[PDB]
Write an enzyme that holds these catalytic residues in place. Structure first.
Site, PDB file in Angstrom:
ATOM      1  N   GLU A  21      -5.872   2.307  -4.130  1.00  0.00           N
ATOM      2  CA  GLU A  21      -4.914   1.742  -3.190  1.00  0.00           C
ATOM      3  C   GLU A  21      -4.217   0.529  -3.801  1.00  0.00           C
ATOM      4  O   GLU A  21      -4.727  -0.079  -4.763  1.00  0.00           O
ATOM      5  CB  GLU A  21      -5.640   1.351  -1.919  1.00  0.00           C
ATOM      6  CG  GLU A  21      -6.503   0.113  -2.125  1.00  0.00           C
ATOM      7  CD  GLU A  21      -7.637  -0.024  -1.156  1.00  0.00           C
ATOM      8  OE1 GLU A  21      -7.615   0.558  -0.037  1.00  0.00           O
ATOM      9  OE2 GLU A  21      -8.533  -0.802  -1.507  1.00  0.00           O
ATOM     10  N   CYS A  76       0.841  -1.184   0.000  1.00  0.00           N
ATOM     11  CA  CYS A  76       0.000   0.000   0.000  1.00  0.00           C
ATOM     12  C   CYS A  76       0.879   1.237   0.000  1.00  0.00           C
ATOM     13  O   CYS A  76       0.594   2.179  -0.744  1.00  0.00           O
ATOM     14  CB  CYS A  76      -1.018  -0.050   1.163  1.00  0.00           C
ATOM     15  SG  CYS A  76      -0.325   0.336   2.753  1.00  0.00           S
ATOM     16  N   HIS A 124      -2.800   1.138   6.896  1.00  0.00           N
ATOM     17  CA  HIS A 124      -3.125   1.085   5.485  1.00  0.00           C
ATOM     18  C   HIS A 124      -3.242   2.495   4.971  1.00  0.00           C
ATOM     19  O   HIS A 124      -3.490   3.415   5.727  1.00  0.00           O
ATOM     20  CB  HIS A 124      -4.428   0.295   5.254  1.00  0.00           C
ATOM     21  CG  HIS A 124      -4.771   0.090   3.810  1.00  0.00           C
ATOM     22  ND1 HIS A 124      -3.930  -0.498   2.938  1.00  0.00           N
ATOM     23  CD2 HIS A 124      -5.868   0.432   3.097  1.00  0.00           C
ATOM     24  CE1 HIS A 124      -4.473  -0.542   1.740  1.00  0.00           C
ATOM     25  NE2 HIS A 124      -5.654   0.040   1.807  1.00  0.00           N
TER      26      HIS A 124
HETATM   27 CL   LIG Z   1      -1.968  -2.038   3.516  1.00  0.00          CL
END
Ligand SMILES: [Cl-]
Ligand code: MMC
Ligand code: MMC
Ligand SMILES: [Ca+2]
Ligand SMILES: [Hg+2]
Ligand SMILES: [Hg+2]
Length: 164
Positions: free
Chosen positions: A133, A53, A116
């Site tokens: 993402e 990410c 995240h």
């Molecule tokens: Cl992540």
């Protein structure tokens, strides 16, 4: 700084696998047996852990800052540093609606350990928004992908500078 038109163009190019980035995989790439083979379009900015990410944000911030700012740390560590002038860290309050091109940072719940992170693709409403993402699947193999998020675990937004 980049214009909103430039920002918006870049987000679509991330999602299409066509972004002008030297960290975009051109041909399906593997080095880490724990992760899936990175497909063309995956962003790997550090040469570890395939396409995570934070790789997306490292690239994005490098582009925004004309290669002046390289992020360090995990997703969750992004709120503990500054990308520089005109970047602003906002807490996610339940009023708070993000804007397109802002960075969404998840640091609570299941996201606590590493965090995240992703880019706001559509600011949405108070209920949902669309994120762009990497590695929401865990396999670290896919290019940046859009997903509808419900703000669960989302603690901060990083406002980015936008040129007129
Ligand atoms: Cl992540
Ligand atoms: C290189 Hg912006
Ligand atoms: C709201 Hg900073
Ligand atoms: Ca990586
Ligand atoms: Hg500029
Ligand atoms: Hg969670």
């Amino acid at each position: 700084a980049k214009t909103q038109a430039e920002i918006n163009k870049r987000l679509d190019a991330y999602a299409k696998g066509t972004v002008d980035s030297p960290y975009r995989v051109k041909k399906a790439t593997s080095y880490d047996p724990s992760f899936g083979v990175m497909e063309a379009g995956a962003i790997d900015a550090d040469g570890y852990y395939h396409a995570q990410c934070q790789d997306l944000i490292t690239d994005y911030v490098l582009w925004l800052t004309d290669n002046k700012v390289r992020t360090w740390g995990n997703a969750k560590d992004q709120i503990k540093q500054s990308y520089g002038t005109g970047f602003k860290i906002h807490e996610n309050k339940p009023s708070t609606v993000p804007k397109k091109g802002w960075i969404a940072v998840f640091t609570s719940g299941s996201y606590e350990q590493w965090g995240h992170i992703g880019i706001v693709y559509d600011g949405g409403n108070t209920s949902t928004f669309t994120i762009l993402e990497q590695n929401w699947n865990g396999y670290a193999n896919k290019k940046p992908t859009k997903r509808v998020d419900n703000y669960y675990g989302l603690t901060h937004f990083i406002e980015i500078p936008v040129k007129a």
